Structures are given as structure tokens and as C-alpha cells.
Enzyme design. Structure first.
Site, mmCIF file in Angstrom:
data_model
loop_
_atom_site.group_PDB
_atom_site.id
_atom_site.type_symbol
_atom_site.label_atom_id
_atom_site.label_comp_id
_atom_site.label_asym_id
_atom_site.label_seq_id
_atom_site.Cartn_x
_atom_site.Cartn_y
_atom_site.Cartn_z
ATOM 1 N N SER A 61 21.451 -20.069 -9.007
ATOM 2 C CA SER A 61 20.172 -19.365 -8.935
ATOM 3 C C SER A 61 19.171 -19.769 -10.014
ATOM 4 C CB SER A 61 20.391 -17.857 -9.000
ATOM 5 O OG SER A 61 20.941 -17.414 -7.765
ATOM 6 N N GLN A 117 22.248 -12.434 0.849
ATOM 7 C CA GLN A 117 22.567 -13.706 1.479
ATOM 8 C C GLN A 117 22.001 -13.761 2.892
ATOM 9 O OE1 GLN A 117 23.530 -15.992 -0.326
ATOM 10 N NE2 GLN A 117 24.806 -15.150 -1.992
ATOM 11 N N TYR A 147 17.556 -8.093 -5.408
ATOM 12 C CA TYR A 147 17.736 -9.535 -5.551
ATOM 13 C C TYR A 147 18.288 -10.147 -4.274
ATOM 14 C CZ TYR A 147 19.127 -13.821 -8.017
ATOM 15 O OH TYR A 147 19.294 -15.109 -8.452
ATOM 16 N N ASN A 149 18.588 -13.944 -1.815
ATOM 17 C CA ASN A 149 18.269 -15.319 -1.416
ATOM 18 C C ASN A 149 17.428 -15.369 -0.142
ATOM 19 O OD1 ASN A 149 19.704 -16.446 -3.548
ATOM 20 N ND2 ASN A 149 21.616 -16.492 -2.372
ATOM 21 N N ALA A 315 24.622 -19.046 -10.586
ATOM 22 C CA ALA A 315 26.027 -19.272 -10.291
ATOM 23 C C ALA A 315 26.171 -19.884 -8.915
ATOM 24 C CB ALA A 315 26.843 -17.974 -10.373
ATOM 25 N N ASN A 340 32.344 -20.394 -12.705
ATOM 26 C CA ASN A 340 31.521 -19.181 -12.635
ATOM 27 C C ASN A 340 32.214 -18.091 -13.453
ATOM 28 O OD1 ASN A 340 29.758 -17.129 -12.008
ATOM 29 N ND2 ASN A 340 30.338 -17.006 -9.835
HETATM 30 C C1 LIG Z 1 25.392 -18.723 -0.662
HETATM 31 N N1 LIG Z 1 26.232 -19.853 -1.007
HETATM 32 C C2 LIG Z 1 27.040 -20.506 -0.188
HETATM 33 N N2 LIG Z 1 27.637 -21.467 -0.868
HETATM 34 N N3 LIG Z 1 27.185 -21.403 -2.148
HETATM 35 C C3 LIG Z 1 26.326 -20.408 -2.202
HETATM 36 S S1 LIG Z 1 25.415 -19.869 -3.704
HETATM 37 C C4 LIG Z 1 26.578 -18.769 -4.598
HETATM 38 C C5 LIG Z 1 27.898 -18.692 -4.240
HETATM 39 C C6 LIG Z 1 28.745 -17.849 -4.978
HETATM 40 C C7 LIG Z 1 28.258 -17.106 -6.033
HETATM 41 C C8 LIG Z 1 26.937 -17.186 -6.395
HETATM 42 C C9 LIG Z 1 26.089 -18.025 -5.660
HETATM 43 N N4 LIG Z 1 24.670 -18.178 -5.995
HETATM 44 S S2 LIG Z 1 23.570 -16.972 -5.549
HETATM 45 O O1 LIG Z 1 23.888 -16.468 -4.205
HETATM 46 O O2 LIG Z 1 22.257 -17.626 -5.463
HETATM 47 C C10 LIG Z 1 23.722 -15.648 -6.796
HETATM 48 C C11 LIG Z 1 23.999 -14.343 -6.436
HETATM 49 C C12 LIG Z 1 24.136 -13.398 -7.426
HETATM 50 C C13 LIG Z 1 24.003 -13.773 -8.781
HETATM 51 C C14 LIG Z 1 23.735 -15.090 -9.131
HETATM 52 CL CL1 LIG Z 1 23.574 -15.469 -10.868
HETATM 53 C C15 LIG Z 1 23.599 -16.047 -8.154
HETATM 54 O O3 LIG Z 1 23.334 -17.465 -8.420
#
Ligand SMILES: Cn1cnnc1Sc1ccccc1NS(=O)(=O)c1cccc(Cl)c1O
Length: 358
Positions: A61, A117, A147, A149, A315, A340
Site C-alpha cells: 500500500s 478488497q 480504508y 483498495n 504490505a 509482512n
Molecule cells: C489484494 N492482494 C492480492 N494479492 N496481493 C494483494 S495486496 C495485500 C495482500 C495481503 C496483505 C496486504 C495487502 N496489501 S493491501 O490490501 O493493499 C493492505 C491492506 C491493509 C493494510 C495494508 Cl498496510 C495494506 O497494504
């Protein structure tokens, strides 16, 4: 590297790596505008490849700070306005719940409950249209922050539509190239795969998989050197020669909403400096950072405040990143890891380091 920096960094990061079982880590400190680099451990445990200053990490993120600045650059170019309805750039979004939801709401997670998501069932673009058409807000626009995506991801995709460029093409030509971030990628090219660290989740080597709006919400990979340059660019936007980009960086650090002691920018989040460290440390725990919280509008937004702690955690399944800087002190930090590990451990380490140097 001055001995003071060396000492504080190693005294903080060494126990962190041991306590969290982090396979590899890169750290950059920006001190009086110059970067100092530190590396530990393994980018690839199997092939015994060390972390170096050229290792690529998944930013997760922290990618949203690039999306926020690219949106800001689009505003500065006059291509979009934050006060414009979402439907101006997506006319097919005809469902009535979108009346009154602006690009600002999308960029700042305040549209009224868009989910964290995009559902993995959504692959095609007609799936995406269907998802947003059928989504039902829990709250009126501009009243609660959640928050998401699916919120800032849609913002990024819409903000580049007047340019006619793909998101990746816009990001490369309008942000990466002007800032000479020559080892920062949405898609890692074959030429750079040898530098691409593996992420580690429960001991398994993993890379992020493709998903809807992945480039816009969590898809950037970068080196510690490029990320230090990203921090320098955001610490001192006025040194930047491209006018709309300098302006876009300032727009992304404007304060649009307040919840508790945190202010919401475009991608970036900000607090007044000096900070109460327990506020940012506990505040970074996902339990608070991902919760639905009421917001107060800042009418009109406050321009970038120099006396701020500006930061973003990030993450993926296999990676954990953190960026923070203080414009008034010329001070900043980047922490990139291929595990992570919990956010409060990141912010505690970063605050210990920057507090000792200010
Ligand atoms: C969607 N997806 C599919 N394959 N990989 C991804 S990303 C991901 C995967 C696993 C954990 C965190 C992310 N990143 S996140 O959803 O943006 C996020 C949420 C909450 C806090 C932070 Cl700090 C953050 O980064």
C-alpha cells in the site's frame, strides 16, 4: 554514514529483525537531505542472494502514495478535478447511489463504505462495472472513512482516463521518469528479475498475484535507493522541475479529512509534528487503521503543513514496508522487508530512529 546514524539504525533494526524473524531488510535514512543506506539478510533464502541497494521489494500500500501523487499531477494538468462526480469519467456508472460521490471521496476512502478488497470474483472489466453498479453504500458520502483498495484503486484508474494513457504508462512517464526512479516498476521487467526479492509468508516464498486494480492500489515494486529518492522528492517538492508534478506532490499532502489526530491526504496520511508516538504506533495497528471511522471535513483543505509526520504503511502477503518523513526537519526514513510483520513494530522502530536524529 555519521556514527550517530549508524548507531541508532543498527541498535533499532537489529533487534527488530531478530524479534520478527525478518529474512531480509533494507533501510534508508534521509538526514539533512542526504540518504544513508543499510541492508541485512536475504532477498532469496534458497539461492542465498543477499539484500542489496538494488533489491526490489513489493511496496504494497505504499503504492497508494504514487497513485495519490499521479492523481495530484492530473489535477495540476487540469485533466480532472477532485470536486467532479465519479460518473463524469465513468458514464456507465448510472446507479443512483453514485450521485454525489466525487473523485475526492474515492481518493480518500470516504465514498460511504467501499470494501477493503475488490472481490476476487471480479476479473474482467465488465465484472468491475457490475461490482460498482451493485455496491450499496452504508453511509452518505464524506461522512465515514473506511480504508479500501476498491476506493483509491478506482480513483487511480479514473484519474488517468482523460490523458488517454494506461495507468502504468501515465505513472512511468509522469512520475517515475521525471523523478529518475529508474528501478521502480508496476510490472518487473525480465531484465530486473534477478533483483526481485521473494516475499516470505509462513516460510513460503511468494510474489503478489494479479488482481483487479492491483497497479493502482498495491502494485509498485522498488529499490531502497529509488524509495529514498521518492522520500526526498516529497520532502522538498519545490526542487522538482516539472511544474504539474511539483504541484501534484503538494496536493497529495494537503489535509482533506480529520479522524482523531490523523489527517487524510491523497495516499499520504499526516499528523502534526511533534507526534505522540503511542498515537502513531497504536494507530498503525490494522485494527485501528482499517476500522470505519467518522471524519470531519477540512473545508477547504489545508495545504501541505511542513511541521508534519507524513507516512504510509504497506504490505503484501510476503512483504512489509513503511515510509515516513518530517518536512520541517529535512528528515525521513524508508523500511523495506520481505516479510509482512505487524505495523506497530514498524512505526515504533521508525519513531525511535527519527526522534534520535531530530
Ligand atoms: C489484494 N492482494 C492480492 N494479492 N496481493 C494483494 S495486496 C495485500 C495482500 C495481503 C496483505 C496486504 C495487502 N496489501 S493491501 O490490501 O493493499 C493492505 C491492506 C491493509 C493494510 C495494508 Cl498496510 C495494506 O497494504
Amino acid at each position: 554514514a555519521p556514527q550517530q546514524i549508524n548507531d541508532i539504525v543498527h541498535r533499532t533494526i537489529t533487534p527488530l529483525i531478530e524479534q520478527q524473524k525478518i529474512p531480509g531488510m533494507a533501510v534508508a535514512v534521509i538526514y539533512q537531505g542526504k540518504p544513508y543506506y543499510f541492508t541485512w539478510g536475504y532477498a532469496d533464502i534458497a539461492k542465498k542472494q543477499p539484500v542489496t541497494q538494488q533489491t526490489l521489494f513489493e511496496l504494497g500500500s505504499v503504492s497508494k502514495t504514487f497513485t495519490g501523487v499521479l492523481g495530484g499531477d492530473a489535477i495540476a494538468r487540469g485533466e480532472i478535478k477532485l470536486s467532479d462526480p465519479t460518473t463524469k469519467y465513468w458514464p456507465e456508472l448510472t446507479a443512483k447511489q453514485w450521485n454525489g460521490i466525487t473523485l475526492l471521496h474515492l481518493a480518500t476512502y470516504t465514498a460511504g463504505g467501499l470494501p477493503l478488497q475488490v472481490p476476487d470474483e471480479v476479473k474482467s472489466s465488465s465484472d468491475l462495472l457490475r461490482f460498482y453498479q451493485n455496491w450499496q453504500p452504508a453511509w452518505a458520502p464524506g461522512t465515514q472513512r473506511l480504508y479500501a483498495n476498491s476506493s483509491i484503486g478506482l480513483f487511480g484508474a479514473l484519474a488517468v482516463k482523460p490523458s488517454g494513457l494506461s495507468f502504468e504508462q501515465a505513472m512511468q512517464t509522469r512520475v517515475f521518469q521525471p523523478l529518475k526512479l529508474n528501478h521502480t516498476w508496476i510490472n518487473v521487467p525480465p531484465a530486473e528479475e534477478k533483483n526481485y526479492a521473494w516475499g516470505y509468508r509462513e516460510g513460503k516464498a511468494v510474489h503478489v498475484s494479479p488482481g483487479a486494480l492491483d497497479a493502482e492500489a498495491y502494485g509498485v515494486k522498488s529499490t531502497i535507493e529509488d524509495m529514498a529518492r521518492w522520500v526526498q522528492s516529497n520532502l522538498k517538492p519545490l526542487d522538482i522541475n516539472e511544474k504539474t508534478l511539483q504541484q501534484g506532490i503538494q496536493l497529495a499532502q494537503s489535509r482533506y479529512w480529520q479522524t482523531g489526530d490523523m489527517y487524510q491526504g491523497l495516499g499520504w496520511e499526516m499528523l502534526d509534528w511533534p507526534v505522540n508516538p503511542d498515537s502513531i504506533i497504536n494507530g498503525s495497528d490494522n485494527k485501528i487503521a482499517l476500522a470505519a471511522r467518522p471524519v470531519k471535513a477540512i473545508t477547504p483543505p489545508t495545504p501541505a503543513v511542513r511541521a508534519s509526520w507524513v507516512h504510509k504503511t504497506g504490505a503484501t502477503g510476503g512483504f512489509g514496508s513503511y515510509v515516513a518523513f518530517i518536512p520541517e526537519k529535512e528528515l525521513g526514513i524508508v523500511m523495506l522487508a520481505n516479510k509482512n510483520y505487524p505495523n506497530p513494530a514498524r512505526v515504533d522502530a521508525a519513531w525511535q530512529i527519527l526522534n534520535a536524529l531530530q
